């Protein structure tokens, strides 16, 4: 008829996510004599009207 | 518009506040109207709740509850609360 | 008929003008909007526009109301019946 | 060792250096509680300046503290330090520009 | 409407102060956000004025920075306070 | 209030306060588990998975029962290593939610979200 | 963008890709525009953890940016050690006190600026409305003429 | 059986997503865009909303949450982990990690009945 829960609903399966290992060197130079970062502080707003 | 009752209180469904600093809140007007009525001294329980919400939440709320009003208020992300009790309507948001 | 108001705008520095306008705006957005909520989005609007943002203002017949502000920007007026309060916050 | 209540909204520094500026941060605002600013500015950037062994080099050092403000700044690697002082609520900008 | 800005504390030159309002009027009304608007400054002012540079936009702060001598200038518009300075 | 007691008709819904409450209820274990914040060798990705097992049935625990529970964690190492895990579930409005908790020490990120879906 | 029919003709409900928990609407206010400006749609979408990390690749555009960046502060310090080291007979002066004698008094001030903020205050405001008063009257024929005479 | 969740159908969506914001295939590195701080932020908005429309196409009456893991160039070791508190013969879930030049990107997909 209408929706209603009897049936079991308990069991539960995991999965393993992961990625693959690969060289130490990586061909990249770690950070930059100067960074760029652009810090807020202020609250994104919002407007609403009740009556 | 439209309304809806949750925690023995008439609230605007669509929660714009976060649904935890919601319930604490009107768990403690429910508490605060059980204590001091708002037809004799009524000034009194608005400046209680709006100190309550400075300490357990982020500072500088507006407490706004009347039978009868219209607003329109800017405020934050997820920090506006509308709920009538009984016939008494109040708003309340975060700066 | 605006027996208690409470002023608490700057007046001093030619800031009069920021005083005049609530009186003056709300005079004019009562009588031809005659809708509580559309009040308070028009005065808000008026004196976003002119000094900048982050004023609350929020219109009723009967209300209570405690509220943190910026010194010397609220003022609280009856106009007519009705019972107007707009102050900056921010 | 205590440490005053602070939100990190991008803490880019060693936690040493970190925790040694928010002490002192704490301290000088509870000196002259409701002074401006820049009062609390030009004391802060002396002390981790005088301070040995807190030295990044390249840059200056420079503090930025106030209520509301975004910004963007170019900065030296592993010198910026945001945090915002839970009692006070004013946020605080330190870092070093090249 | 939006009238040009005022600036109070000032090391510029009188050809760069009107490259400074320039880009300022341009950015206000191009981004809404507060960390929008210092963001154009600053890679705009890396194009003309060298790499490094550095820009802020606040309703209510204060500082003390070291800056580049003529490398420096603060401009208030309308109920907005933009700090920025180079190195 | 027969609008009301229609809406319980249409959807059944039992919207327990799912957010914060949870949000509390995973910030409070992980921080008990990550244990020492300086361990993040290869061993201890297998102690990770024990972590994501444990989570689940605390928060069938936290008020959720005919909720639908999915949760998904990630434990990673940071050297200054800029990502991004953003998340965008396909749902009813109002009628589900979503639960996030990220905790950084100094040299390790242990990000935690929990997707909550109503069946009946 | 589909629709969930509910079963024994229940109300028809929907499933939106849209994440109820990020706010309706976001409104920030423009100073060219010079008023408020609302924007009712939202990029509802959910980050958990963000992270932004220095980390350039070799043959970025990135880098060369920062290589010259360097080569620039490098020449101004080799002129300003070799000037130094030109003037002044076998100077003994080691590479980082010449950028301390690089920066000057009359080659980097160093200025103050705050903006003036308003002191916040937390006042009380209640209105209540004029007092209402039962009256009861009644009026017969007589009542009026009697008056009325 | 009209409706029902399969393994390869929700993989393949994944693929074509993963395909449509930077992969023409093929067998060769045609294409390569190095991870930007500027272009994550865009690239995952975009990844998200086509896998959401990719399941939309062939989806049946399945709720649908995915969640965007991006690594800037490996060297970190990350390990994802996925548990769903859902009925067997009902519901099933999959994780599918890329390994697509510079960037490194983990996918996850949940499937909920309706």
């Not at chain 2, 714009?16 to 001091?36: P, V």
């Not at chain 7, 020449?75 to 080291?85: C, D, T, V």
Request: aromatic letters at 12%.
């Amino acid at each position: 008829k209408e929706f209603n829960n009897p049936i079991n609903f308990q069991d539960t399966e995991t999965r393993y996510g992961g990625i693959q290992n690969q060289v130490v060197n990586i061909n990249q130079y770690v950070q930059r004599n100067p960074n760029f970062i652009d810090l807020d502080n202020i609250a994104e707003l919002s407007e609403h009207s009740v009556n | 518009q439209q309304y809806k009752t949750f925690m023995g209180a008439r609230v605007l469904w669509p929660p714009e506040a976060a649904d935890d600093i919601l319930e604490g809140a009107i768990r403690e007007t429910q508490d605060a109207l059980k204590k001091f009525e708002i037809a004799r001294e009524g000034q009194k329980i608005a400046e209680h709740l709006k100190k309550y919400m400075d300490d357990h939440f982020d500072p500088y709320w507006h407490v706004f509850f009347g039978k009868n009003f219209g607003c329109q208020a800017v405020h934050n992300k997820n920090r506006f609360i509308y709920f009538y009790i009984e016939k008494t309507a109040f708003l309340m948001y975060q700066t | 008929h605006a027996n208690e108001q409470i002023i608490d705008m700057p007046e001093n520095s030619e800031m009069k003008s920021m005083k005049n306008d609530a009186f003056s705006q709300a005079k004019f957005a009562v009588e031809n909007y005659k809708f509580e909520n559309k009040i308070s989005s028009h005065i808000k609007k008026f004196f976003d526009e002119k000094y900048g943002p982050n004023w609350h203002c929020v219109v009723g017949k009967h209300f209570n109301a405690y509220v943190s502000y910026d010194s010397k920007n609220f003022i609280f007026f009856y106009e007519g019946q009705l019972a107007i309060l707009l102050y900056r916050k921010g | 060792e205590p440490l005053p209540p602070h939100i990190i909204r991008f803490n880019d520094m060693a936690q040493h250096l970190l925790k040694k500026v928010i002490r002192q941060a704490d301290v000088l605002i509870k000196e002259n509680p409701q002074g401006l600013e820049k009062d609390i500015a030009l004391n802060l950037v002396k002390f981790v300046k005088s301070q040995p062994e807190f030295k990044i080099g390249d840059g200056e050092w420079q503090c930025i503290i106030g209520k509301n403000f975004g910004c963007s700044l170019t900065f030296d690697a592993n010198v910026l330090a945001f945090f915002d002082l839970l009692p006070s609520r004013k946020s605080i900008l330190l870092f070093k520009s090249g | 409407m939006n009238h040009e800005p005022e600036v109070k504390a000032t090391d510029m030159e009188e050809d760069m102060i009107k490259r400074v309002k320039e880009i300022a009027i341009n950015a206000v009304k191009e981004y809404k956000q507060e960390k929008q608007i210092a963001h154009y400054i600053k890679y705009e002012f890396d194009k003309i004025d060298g790499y490094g540079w550095n820009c802020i936009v606040g309703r209510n702060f204060g500082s003390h920075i070291i800056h580049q001598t003529k490398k420096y200038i603060f401009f208030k518009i309308n109920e907005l306070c933009l700090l920025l300075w180079k190195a | 209030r027969k609008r009301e007691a229609s809406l319980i008709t249409l959807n059944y819904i039992k919207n327990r306060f799912y957010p914060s409450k949870i949000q509390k209820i995973i910030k409070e274990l992980f921080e008990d588990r990550l244990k020492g914040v300086e361990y993040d060798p290869n061993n201890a990705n297998q102690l990770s998975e024990r972590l994501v097992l444990e989570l689940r049935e605390k928060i069938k625990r936290g008020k959720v029962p005919r909720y639908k529970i999915g949760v998904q964690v990630v434990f990673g190492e940071i050297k200054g290593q800029g990502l991004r895990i953003a998340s965008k579930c396909l749902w009813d409005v109002q009628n589900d939610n979503y639960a996030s908790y990220t905790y950084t020490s100094e040299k390790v990120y242990c990000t935690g979200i929990v997707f909550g879906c109503y069946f009946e | 963008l589909t629709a969930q029919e509910l079963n024994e003709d229940m109300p028809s409900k929907m499933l939106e890709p849209k994440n109820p928990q990020a706010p309706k609407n976001i409104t920030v206010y423009d100073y060219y525009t010079r008023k408020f400006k609302t924007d009712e749609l939202v990029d509802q979408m959910i980050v958990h953890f963000s992270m932004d990390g220095d980390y350039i690749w070799k043959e970025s555009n990135e880098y060369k940016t920062q290589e010259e960046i360097r080569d620039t502060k490098k020449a101004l310090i080799k002129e300003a050690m070799r000037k130094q080291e030109s003037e002044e007979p076998g100077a003994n002066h080691d590479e980082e006190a010449i950028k301390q004698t690089l920066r000057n008094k009359f080659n980097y001030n160093t200025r103050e600026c705050q903006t003036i903020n308003p002191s916040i205050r937390e006042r009380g405001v209640s209105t209540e409305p004029p007092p209402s008063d039962t009256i009861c009257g009644n009026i017969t024929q007589w009542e009026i003429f009697d008056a009325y005479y | 059986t009209d409706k029902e969740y399969i393994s390869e159908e929700v993989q393949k969506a994944i693929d074509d997503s993963v395909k449509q914001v930077f992969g023409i295939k093929d067998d060769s590195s045609q294409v390569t865009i190095t991870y930007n701080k500027d272009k994550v932020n865009l690239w995952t908005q975009q990844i998200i909303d086509y896998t959401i429309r990719g399941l939309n196409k062939l989806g049946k009456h399945f709720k649908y949450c995915v969640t965007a893991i991006l690594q800037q160039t490996n060297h970190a070791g990350i390990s994802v982990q996925i548990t769903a508190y859902q009925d067997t013969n009902t519901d099933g879930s999959l994780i599918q990690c890329y390994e697509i030049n510079d960037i490194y990107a983990i996918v996850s997909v949940f499937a909920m009945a309706v």
